[PDB]
Design an enzyme around this catalytic site. Sequence first.
Site, PDB file in Angstrom:
ATOM      1  N   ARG A  17       0.958  -1.246   0.154  1.00 18.05           N
ATOM      2  CA  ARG A  17       0.079   0.045  -0.032  1.00 18.05           C
ATOM      3  C   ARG A  17       0.836   1.365  -0.092  1.00 18.05           C
ATOM      4  O   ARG A  17       0.301   2.487   0.345  1.00 18.05           O
ATOM      5  CB  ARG A  17      -0.923   0.010   1.129  1.00 18.05           C
ATOM      6  CG  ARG A  17      -2.062  -1.092   1.148  1.00 18.05           C
ATOM      7  CD  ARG A  17      -2.914  -0.857   2.560  1.00 18.05           C
ATOM      8  NE  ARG A  17      -4.028   0.380   2.136  1.00 18.05           N
ATOM      9  CZ  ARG A  17      -3.966   1.352   3.068  1.00 18.05           C
ATOM     10  NH1 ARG A  17      -2.895   1.574   3.582  1.00 18.05           N
ATOM     11  NH2 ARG A  17      -4.644   2.072   2.677  1.00 18.05           N
ATOM     12  N   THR A 171     -18.856   4.440  17.552  1.00 14.32           N
ATOM     13  CA  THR A 171     -19.859   5.078  18.047  1.00 14.32           C
ATOM     14  C   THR A 171     -20.937   4.239  18.181  1.00 14.32           C
ATOM     15  O   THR A 171     -21.221   3.641  16.999  1.00 14.32           O
ATOM     16  CB  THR A 171     -20.217   6.618  17.690  1.00 14.32           C
ATOM     17  OG1 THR A 171     -19.281   7.353  17.338  1.00 14.32           O
ATOM     18  CG2 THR A 171     -21.061   7.115  18.509  1.00 14.32           C
ATOM     19  N   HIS A 192      -8.038   6.940   5.928  1.00 17.84           N
ATOM     20  CA  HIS A 192      -7.717   6.337   4.666  1.00 17.84           C
ATOM     21  C   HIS A 192      -6.426   5.766   4.271  1.00 17.84           C
ATOM     22  O   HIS A 192      -6.095   5.150   3.645  1.00 17.84           O
ATOM     23  CB  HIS A 192      -8.527   7.121   3.476  1.00 17.84           C
ATOM     24  CG  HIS A 192      -9.182   5.996   2.425  1.00 17.84           C
ATOM     25  ND1 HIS A 192      -8.442   5.126   1.754  1.00 17.84           N
ATOM     26  CD2 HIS A 192     -10.308   6.236   1.748  1.00 17.84           C
ATOM     27  CE1 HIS A 192      -8.958   4.561   1.035  1.00 17.84           C
ATOM     28  NE2 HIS A 192     -10.466   5.240   0.885  1.00 17.84           N
ATOM     29  N   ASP A 196      -8.690   0.779   4.191  1.00 18.92           N
ATOM     30  CA  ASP A 196      -9.561   0.645   3.228  1.00 18.92           C
ATOM     31  C   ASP A 196     -10.753   0.236   3.290  1.00 18.92           C
ATOM     32  O   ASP A 196     -11.044  -0.406   4.228  1.00 18.92           O
ATOM     33  CB  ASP A 196      -8.771   0.060   1.834  1.00 18.92           C
ATOM     34  CG  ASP A 196      -7.303   0.630   1.338  1.00 18.92           C
ATOM     35  OD1 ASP A 196      -7.428   1.777   1.432  1.00 18.92           O
ATOM     36  OD2 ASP A 196      -6.450  -0.293   1.093  1.00 18.92           O
TER      37      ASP A 196
END
Lengths: 215, 215, 216
Positions: A17, A171, A192, A196
């Site tokens: 990544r 939450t 991000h 992903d």
Amino acid sequence: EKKITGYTTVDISQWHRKEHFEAFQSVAQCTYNQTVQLDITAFLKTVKKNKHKFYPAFIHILARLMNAHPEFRMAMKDGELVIWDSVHPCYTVFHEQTETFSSLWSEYHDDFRQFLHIYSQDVACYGENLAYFPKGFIENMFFVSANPWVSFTSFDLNVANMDNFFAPVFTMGKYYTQGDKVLMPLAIQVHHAVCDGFHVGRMLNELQQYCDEWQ
Amino acid sequence: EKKITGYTTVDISQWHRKEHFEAFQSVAQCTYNQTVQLDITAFLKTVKKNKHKFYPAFIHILARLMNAHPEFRMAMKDGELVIWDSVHPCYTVFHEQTETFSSLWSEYHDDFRQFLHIYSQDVACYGENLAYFPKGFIENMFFVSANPWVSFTSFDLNVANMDNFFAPVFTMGKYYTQGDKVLMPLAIQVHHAVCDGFHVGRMLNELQQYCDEWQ
Amino acid sequence: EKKITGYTTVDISQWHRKEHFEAFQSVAQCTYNQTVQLDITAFLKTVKKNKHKFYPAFIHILARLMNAHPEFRMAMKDGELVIWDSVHPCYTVFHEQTETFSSLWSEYHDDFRQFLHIYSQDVACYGENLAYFPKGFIENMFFVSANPWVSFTSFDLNVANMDNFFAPVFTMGKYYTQGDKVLMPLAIQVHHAVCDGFHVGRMLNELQQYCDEWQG
Ligand SMILES: O=C(N[C@H](CO)[C@H](O)c1ccc([N+](=O)[O-])cc1)C(Cl)Cl
Ligand SMILES: O=C(N[C@H](CO)[C@H](O)c1ccc([N+](=O)[O-])cc1)C(Cl)Cl
Ligand SMILES: O=C(N[C@H](CO)[C@H](O)c1ccc([N+](=O)[O-])cc1)C(Cl)Cl
């Protein structure tokens, strides 16, 4: 006397990544929320059949997932991207008399009997303490915000500075009856640069699984 | 001719949210959105039985809550946190011919008959004015945005600059049938320095309650 | 070979939203997300009747809508507000072997049979290419993100720098059964400088209609 927290230095070059992380750190930098209508029909029945409180039980599931995948335990050390060996739950406690909340962290253990014992100890201790962080900061934590007031169809956490803010935020809303099913709103927000759609997707899928397999 | 507005300086020391406000003003600064699926079945039946438009009657209910709780009436004045004696609703009116909107505020009154008289006077007057703000800015005001276009399960206002933006914002959806009940999506964006989960929570509950009474 | 991208410079003086634009570019600048629980019951049965994949079919419907209204085709060119003659979809491809996603774009055409042919050509080409942007960047494009992992009731995208970022973003979720209907979560984020409630409103209302008709 002393305690050290463990991490792993990741070299971006060897990481699949590298190009994504570089992009969501600069030009394409963004965070994203998503809300799911989680089925906890089985998780409620089993929790209620046992002498347990819903809140710490669900916390444990979340932490268990958070300690299951390295894409959630990422942080910026001394300007270097790292993965924590473990990440501990920071949860909210509500003070009814003063109408304020407080955030305290418990130490994480895989064993649920052990975790609840550490939890109860922390909540029997600082539960009536009016400080915002009765125990304080800890480098390696994720966050759980209790929202028992509203069965929300949506929740969005919208931060002013998201730089290096890699710690994921849960939450959880007021659960309710729908047909023969009891559903609970759950929101998850992540950076991000580290997460992903896939990463958050399989975790939320496993989150359903665990809520259908005991504590 | 001349009028002066409500002004209550909060001394931060004597406040139970001293360090909360301090954190969400800098370190943890953020806003947060939540959408809920509001029941208006009883509300629509009583509005439809009388000679009232849906829009102004609901604005009033929101403003009734907004003027019931001080946490929604907070704003920064001359480098100080203040609470307005009263806060007035700013609604959106749509211009169909030019496909744009305008925003105009009306003066709040606890009596509904009187507020609708004000509203009628304000809309009758500027309802066909193509200026973005036909009445201008006012310090003590909260926002209501109309979205009868879409029955949304989610709506998120996402402000670029959230410094001192303590004024709350409502967005209401296209209502729809579901069984015997009539649901209308409603969404609130609020600054975290002035509102915690609890604050938004009780007001949504009171919003439900008030809807289940009369106009 | 050589290609000039078409646009129209908008003079703000004549434009009816000059006041709004100036506000949502400085003082009240904001983006806004909204999620709709889309009814795709008729759209699925039609796509499944033909030998088409769901993804390109839907990509096309969104693109047909962006290229229908100028407010989605807006951007800042050289410090000036321009409207692209057309806007192209940048969709996401997931690589399972490496668990990362790529983003490529296909030149939009109003004819679905045409578009799909280009889309197929692009995916059959760069679908297994592990680069982030296997085709690269393009001035005039909107975004589509596939999220087939979660049947979300809310998707919200919060960008760090929203300056001039007028390109709309779509996120589509995991479709699911609900009685007779088959519903699918859909989110859009737009800049308030270019898009008011009404613009997103009618496009989502048309989006429902175009789904109740055919594939294209
Ligand atoms: O502030 C907290 N919780 C709130 C509750 O509304 C919310 O979950 C939140 C979490 C993190 C945050 N941040 O990191 O800036 C801001 C709000 C504590 Cl968990 Cl620190
Ligand atoms: O901007 C307005 N309305 C939009 C319409 O969706 C929305 O309610 C909104 C309100 C306040 C705001 N702000 O102050 O940053 C931005 C958008 C007018 Cl009410 Cl000023
Ligand atoms: O990163 C991408 N997609 C993600 C998928 O989670 C998302 O759609 C997204 C789109 C635009 C964006 N941006 O430009 O700020 C960021 C993320 C590519 Cl489509 Cl650019």
